[PDB]
Amino acid sequence: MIQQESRLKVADNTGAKEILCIRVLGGSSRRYAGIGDVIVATVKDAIPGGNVKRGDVVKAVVVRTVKERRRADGSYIKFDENAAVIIKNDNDPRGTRIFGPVGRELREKKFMKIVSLAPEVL
Amino acid sequence: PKPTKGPRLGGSSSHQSALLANLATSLFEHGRIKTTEPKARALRPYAEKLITHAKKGALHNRREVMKKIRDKDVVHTLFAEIGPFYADRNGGYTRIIKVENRKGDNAPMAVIELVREK
Amino acid sequence: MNTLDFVDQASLRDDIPTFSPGDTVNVHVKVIEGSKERIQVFKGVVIRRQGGGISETFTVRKESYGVGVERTFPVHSPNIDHIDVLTRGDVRRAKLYYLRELRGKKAKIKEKR
Amino acid sequence: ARKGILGTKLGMTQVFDENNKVVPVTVVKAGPNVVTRIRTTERDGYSAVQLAYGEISPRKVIKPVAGQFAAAGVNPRRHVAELRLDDEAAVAEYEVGQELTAEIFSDGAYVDVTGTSKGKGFAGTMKRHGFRGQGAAHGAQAVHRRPGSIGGCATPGRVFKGTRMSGRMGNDRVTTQNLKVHKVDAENGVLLIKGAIPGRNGGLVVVRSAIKRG
Amino acid sequence: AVPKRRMSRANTRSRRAQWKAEAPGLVTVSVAGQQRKVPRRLLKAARLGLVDLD
RNA sequence: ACCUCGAUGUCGGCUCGUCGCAUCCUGGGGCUGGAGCAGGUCCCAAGGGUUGGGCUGUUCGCCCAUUAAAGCGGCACGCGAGCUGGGUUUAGAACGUCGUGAGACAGUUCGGUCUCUAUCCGCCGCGCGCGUCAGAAGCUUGAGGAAACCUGUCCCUAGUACGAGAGGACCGGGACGGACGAACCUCUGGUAUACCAGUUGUCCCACCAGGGGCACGGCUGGAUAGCCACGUUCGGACAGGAUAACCGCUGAAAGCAUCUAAGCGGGAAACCUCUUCCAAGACCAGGCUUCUCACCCUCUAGGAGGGAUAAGGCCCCCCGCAGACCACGGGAUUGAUAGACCAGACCUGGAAGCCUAGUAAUAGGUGCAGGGAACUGGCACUAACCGGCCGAAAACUUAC
RNA sequence: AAUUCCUUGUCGGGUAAGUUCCGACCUGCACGAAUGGCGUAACGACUUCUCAACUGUCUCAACCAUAGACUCGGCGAAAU
RNA sequence: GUCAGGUAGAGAAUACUAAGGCGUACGAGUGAACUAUGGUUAAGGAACUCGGCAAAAUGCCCCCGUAACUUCGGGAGAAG
Ligand SMILES: [Mg+2]
Ligand SMILES: [Mg+2]
Ligand SMILES: [Mg+2]
Ligand SMILES: [Mg+2]
Ligand SMILES: [Mg+2]
Ligand SMILES: [Mg+2]
Ligand SMILES: [Mg+2]
Ligand SMILES: [Mg+2]
Ligand SMILES: [Mg+2]
Ligand SMILES: [Mg+2]
Ligand SMILES: [Mg+2]
Ligand SMILES: [Mg+2]
Ligand SMILES: [Mg+2]
Ligand SMILES: [Mg+2]
Ligand SMILES: [Mg+2]
Ligand SMILES: [Mg+2]
Ligand SMILES: [Mg+2]
Ligand SMILES: [Mg+2]
Ligand SMILES: [Mg+2]
Ligand SMILES: [Mg+2]
Ligand SMILES: [Mg+2]
Ligand SMILES: [Mg+2]
Ligand SMILES: [Mg+2]
Ligand SMILES: [Mg+2]
Ligand SMILES: [Mg+2]
Ligand SMILES: [Mg+2]
Ligand SMILES: [Mg+2]
Ligand SMILES: [Mg+2]
Ligand SMILES: [Mg+2]
Ligand SMILES: [Mg+2]
Ligand SMILES: [Mg+2]
Ligand SMILES: [Mg+2]
Ligand SMILES: [Mg+2]
Ligand SMILES: [Mg+2]
Ligand SMILES: [Mg+2]
Ligand SMILES: [Mg+2]
Ligand SMILES: [Mg+2]
Ligand SMILES: [Mg+2]
Ligand SMILES: [Mg+2]
Ligand SMILES: [Mg+2]
Ligand SMILES: [Mg+2]
Ligand SMILES: [Mg+2]
Ligand SMILES: [Mg+2]
Ligand SMILES: [Mg+2]
Ligand SMILES: [Mg+2]
Ligand SMILES: [Mg+2]
Ligand SMILES: [Mg+2]
Ligand SMILES: [Mg+2]
Ligand SMILES: [Mg+2]
Ligand SMILES: [Mg+2]
Ligand SMILES: [Mg+2]
Ligand SMILES: [Mg+2]
Ligand SMILES: [Mg+2]
Ligand SMILES: [Mg+2]
Ligand SMILES: [Mg+2]
Ligand SMILES: [Mg+2]
Ligand SMILES: [Mg+2]
Ligand SMILES: [Mg+2]
Ligand SMILES: [Mg+2]
Ligand SMILES: [Mg+2]
Ligand SMILES: [Mg+2]
Ligand SMILES: [Mg+2]
Ligand SMILES: [Mg+2]
Ligand SMILES: [Mg+2]
Ligand SMILES: [Mg+2]
Ligand SMILES: [Mg+2]
Ligand SMILES: [Mg+2]
Ligand SMILES: [Mg+2]
Ligand SMILES: [Mg+2]
Ligand SMILES: [Mg+2]
Ligand SMILES: [Mg+2]
Ligand SMILES: [Mg+2]
Ligand SMILES: [Mg+2]
Ligand SMILES: [Mg+2]
Ligand SMILES: [Mg+2]
Ligand SMILES: [Mg+2]
Ligand SMILES: [Mg+2]
Ligand SMILES: [Mg+2]
Ligand SMILES: [Mg+2]
Ligand SMILES: [Mg+2]
Ligand SMILES: [Mg+2]
Ligand SMILES: [Mg+2]
Ligand SMILES: [Mg+2]
Ligand SMILES: [Mg+2]
Ligand SMILES: [Mg+2]
Ligand SMILES: [Mg+2]
Questions:
Q1: Given A84, B15, B41, D186, which residue has the most CB atoms within 10 angstroms?
Q2: Which of A70, A71, A73 to mutate to test the interface with D (most CBs of D within 10 A)?
Q3: Are strands A16-24 and A7-10 parallel, antiparallel or unpaired?
Q4: Residue D139, CB, less than 7 Å from strand F?
């Protein structure tokens, strides 16, 4: 449940390690982005040697959030930290490897590449 | 029992508690007191649960009532008279009857007493 | 008693073992992967049990690839097919929320005697 | 024709469908109704059926109401309402005396549920009308929950009837529509509706068929 | 705010009219063999001698 | 220079709106230098919608990320007895400039009190009285109003129409959303001032043990009910009528022609039904039906006045998730209305006493223990009473 | 520039976005040497810009208690 | 202006208390809006605003360890 000006730990090896939200995509006047909701972001700090450098405006997708998410079957998935992966405009990650577990909602948002690439899916 | 729904009776939450405890002590000591009608309505269930503690004779129940009441003569008289007196009455140990209104503030008055029939 | 009991007795589940918060369990959840039924096991520590009878829920915590995970289930959910209690924990609470703030060897549970 | 029944709101719980998805349900006792009267255009000016629900002691029935039930031939009930029908061919199948139970509905049937919503007392414009408040800081002076402007200056010089102000809230007829009947417990005279129903527990509701989704 | 005009006698007497009292409803009780009138609220308390019938 | 100088408070922002259409989006079209995609221009259309930030005191404006779109205006450049007070316009100080100076500057900079118990109209809710040709009660019809109306993406159709290629639809179907609104509390989450536990300081209950008062509920960890959103569910429809622009049919005047002159049609989120809610003080004060349908006295017999009643209601009483009071709803012994009591659900988390292990702090057992509010079911034990107050009919005319 | 109207001057930094800010440039409307000029460690309830932390300031508000408001009894004004 | 019990405590601070002194002069009710004064708040964390205004936050003792700069005193309780 991510606002604008919310900071999310980047969860792939693009080089960035923190981002800040700029807008939530998926509708006019939208507020929150749970798991599976693509946002536009600004990179707030990155490893200096990476390709994704600091200040770059990028497109990321949330893969785990601290706020609980109801599932259709009555179950809930809740993480201990907010994380996003930087993807392309082609709906696939820019990095070559995903770190940490990833909430299962990306499979019905057609983020096939990420779900295939994260060590284990929740 | 069920809490006060509106603002607490003595002007605050802590004053209502001590106010109830003093009212219950006086009721058990004298067997009949006259106070205001809301205070009497609040004192009925609170005093009857102490009487229930006194009806069943254990050290644990004596400790609970001493926790709430803080007067050892009244605790003795509870467990020596009132508990045994109500060994065959199942609840409803008290009786509130409405009496004439006060004069200074025209406060609705009432009297609580202990039932002496069975 | 408890008015809607007559509507809720029907769907209550048998074969749910007794388990208290502090217990290490594995819960087998059945999950569809493109209409293909697989079974996925969540092995964690029970950190609460919010009381409701049919609406009874329980929360499990598990530390996975460096990130903590909470999974909350309804106790009588039929996606759960099986709950295994592996060990019994020694706790003094009904809700072990502090485990979300402790990490590692300090997230340990005393073994029940 | 638009079928319907009177009942009470027992409470609400959850069920799991066959595909293992939790469904919130409100449980309604759609207990027996006797029809006590028919309204027809030839006599009353419109087609409707007056039916009675509830259990009441005859000692508690006022003599006019008891007489109106005697003219029907049925024992008095607590509540009496009526269904607006549409034509006479609809009221052809209702006769004064007969019965109707929850088995009028079925699985998947969409129903409109009419109830009377909970009372919210004297409510302010934020609770009542969803007003934006005002600032909690930066200098705001005793206006943290007040409506503010209620018109313009000297033209029109008044406050435009219909202005949203603060007053009694709740306690109103509310129809929630297109609510799925998850399951009718036929033997126990209960029906389980997917969603929420207006009113308190043990309140009278009218469960009618849906016109938008019939 | 402040009253713009002095208010008229009809309008003054219109809501001075609402400031009235209602007489309590009395019932009869028998104390010491002689009849007295008391509110039905105080009926029991008169019947067991806890209200002072002057 | 027409009202206001025995006072009409001055910019911007906030809150809350309201109306126009000179239309920003959505809807309907005509012409194109309109192949399609996408446009240009004009016409019709005001139902709903019309984002969050950076820079600046900002309006204006510049930019950032979006969006179907980020419309323009009137209302004392709407709105300070509704807020603010950054701007502007006192008194302090300083810079630059002018002045001999006191000082001054549509020059700049730092600081700089925003009063009011609502009388009347207006508006949002709530009662009391009378009326609707007897007195009451149940269910209703609706004239007349108010509410609501927004919209995107993906996929089939279809890589099809069209096009050299790039590109790529009309129309019709299917799936999921964004914002908004309403009800609700099963789930999630919040809160919890008479719930449970731990704990520090101090005093007290003679002392030990166990507890209590006070320190923001002392603090801390949880927390059922109720209220609630961050939660759950549902909504905007379908269809019909009359149309706007526009498109016509059959057609004279005017031998051909023309949507018009006689006649007949298609035609949009606008209008009328439709959906939801209020609604007979709707004075044309309505309809269906049930109940009571009676009992005397005086004035002087014409009408009135008084009184006792019925059906019914009101107060008193026990309450409510109904509530500012009032009203509303339920109960009132032929009674489960509230409290107590018993049991259950639930919350806390394993009471006290004893025994035991250890030098001890402490740990184990007895034992899902003890405590406990709201939720459910039993139970007349306690209160709902040896009860008062209101409250029922002229006739006449014609038709029958 | 507490000084520059022109002006949101120009270039760099800083932000996703920089009319303030910092470092410089010199076209000083209209700086300038005891009405001192230029620096300066320490000091400041001074003015300005920034980061971390922290939060109901905000998204977007909900709930609890107390004093009023509200009801009952007593007394009992006011500006106008 | 004088006197200055106890227990924590550096303390005449603060919490609770002793002796002593008060309960100080309208009350009784009541879960309305709204105002005031306190409290808590999921996710986010200055996105508010003229401006982090107001709140939140740090806070004590003992060890370790402390920067540019300096007028050699400091900065310094730096920071950690
Ligand atoms: Mg309460
Ligand atoms: Mg209050
Ligand atoms: Mg008070
Ligand atoms: Mg206290
Ligand atoms: Mg439990
Ligand atoms: Mg607010
Ligand atoms: Mg003020
Ligand atoms: Mg304030
Ligand atoms: Mg004004
Ligand atoms: Mg006017
Ligand atoms: Mg002139
Ligand atoms: Mg004049
Ligand atoms: Mg003037
Ligand atoms: Mg004047
Ligand atoms: Mg004036
Ligand atoms: Mg004047
Ligand atoms: Mg306005
Ligand atoms: Mg036009
Ligand atoms: Mg327009
Ligand atoms: Mg168009
Ligand atoms: Mg065109
Ligand atoms: Mg319309
Ligand atoms: Mg600025
Ligand atoms: Mg406007
Ligand atoms: Mg203005
Ligand atoms: Mg204006
Ligand atoms: Mg103003
Ligand atoms: Mg002002
Ligand atoms: Mg100012
Ligand atoms: Mg000056
Ligand atoms: Mg000079
Ligand atoms: Mg109508
Ligand atoms: Mg609502
Ligand atoms: Mg519940
Ligand atoms: Mg909770
Ligand atoms: Mg307690
Ligand atoms: Mg002792
Ligand atoms: Mg001790
Ligand atoms: Mg203590
Ligand atoms: Mg004391
Ligand atoms: Mg607590
Ligand atoms: Mg808590
Ligand atoms: Mg609640
Ligand atoms: Mg012709
Ligand atoms: Mg022609
Ligand atoms: Mg009218
Ligand atoms: Mg009528
Ligand atoms: Mg009556
Ligand atoms: Mg009643
Ligand atoms: Mg119990
Ligand atoms: Mg124990
Ligand atoms: Mg009960
Ligand atoms: Mg009479
Ligand atoms: Mg007459
Ligand atoms: Mg400057
Ligand atoms: Mg200058
Ligand atoms: Mg400039
Ligand atoms: Mg620049
Ligand atoms: Mg500079
Ligand atoms: Mg000089
Ligand atoms: Mg000079
Ligand atoms: Mg000189
Ligand atoms: Mg100088
Ligand atoms: Mg200088
Ligand atoms: Mg210096
Ligand atoms: Mg100084
Ligand atoms: Mg100062
Ligand atoms: Mg809201
Ligand atoms: Mg008060
Ligand atoms: Mg008074
Ligand atoms: Mg001392
Ligand atoms: Mg002191
Ligand atoms: Mg003393
Ligand atoms: Mg009140
Ligand atoms: Mg507050
Ligand atoms: Mg928060
Ligand atoms: Mg938090
Ligand atoms: Mg910051
Ligand atoms: Mg800002
Ligand atoms: Mg900033
Ligand atoms: Mg802003
Ligand atoms: Mg501050
Ligand atoms: Mg503070
Ligand atoms: Mg150091
Ligand atoms: Mg320094
Ligand atoms: Mg330090």
A1: A84
A2: A73
A3: antiparallel
A4: yes
Q: Which residues in B lie closer than 8 A to residue E44 (C-beta atoms)?
A: 97-98
Model resolution, angstroms: 3.0
Q: Answer yes or no: is A2 CB < 7 A from strand H.
A: yes
Task: Give residue E5's region: left, alpha or beta (phi > 0; psi -120 to 50).
Answer: beta
Cis omega before residue D76 (within 30°)? no
Please state which of the four CATH numbers 1.10.260.40, 2.70.40.10, 3.50.50.60, 2.40.150.20 is assigned to the domain occupying A1-122.
2.40.150.20
Closest residue to F119 (CA to C1') is: E3
**Angle ∠(C17,C20,C21) on CA atoms, nearest 5:** 135
For residue D207, give both structure tokens: 């469960």
How many B/E residue pairs have CB atoms within 8 Å?
A: 18
CA B90 to chain centre: 17
Extents of the domains making up chain C: 1-113
List CB contacts (< 8 A) between D22 and chain A.
72-74
**Distance CA E23 to C1' F307 in A:** 22
CB neighbour class for C61 (10 Å; exposed up to 12, middle 13-18, buried from 19): buried
Q: Rounded to an integer, what distance in angstroms lies between the CA atom of residue E47 and that of residue E27?
A: 12
Q: Which two tokens stand for residue E18?
A: 């609402």
Residue D52 approaches strand F within 7 Å at CB? no
Written as six digits, the tokens of E13 are 């007497």
> Do residues B14 and B8 make contact, with C-beta atoms less than 8 angstroms apart?
no
The tokens of D87 are what? 């034509």
Residue the block writes with tokens 């217990």:
C23
